[PDB]
Design a protein around this ligand. Structure first.
Ligand code: ZN
Ligand code: ZN
Ligand code: ZN
Ligand code: ZN
Ligand code: ZN
Ligand code: ZN
Length: 67
């Protein structure tokens, strides 16, 4: 409809509300979506080992164990 086109690397699922990217995460790296692009590392202990210990301090991509 609306004549527009940006670099949407993310899938329709990710671009939905709420995000439907799930754990499969078929979107693109660079969205930092707070649903799929999350981190399971806690401040108590890093779950992946990248020492990110939190999504807000995450430095590794979505193909990581904390994702
Ligand atoms: Zn998403
Ligand atoms: Zn995603
Ligand atoms: Zn995305
Ligand atoms: Zn992480
Ligand atoms: Zn980690
Ligand atoms: Zn990680």
């Amino acid at each position: 409809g609306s004549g527009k086109g940006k670099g949407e690397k993310c899938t329709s699922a990710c671009r939905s509300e709420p995000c439907q990217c799930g754990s499969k995460c078929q979107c693109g790296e660079g969205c930092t979506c707070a649903a799929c692009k999350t981190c399971n590392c806690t401040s108590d202990g890093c779950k992946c080992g990248k020492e990110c210990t939190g999504p807000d301090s995450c430095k590794c991509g979505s193909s990581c164990s904390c994702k």
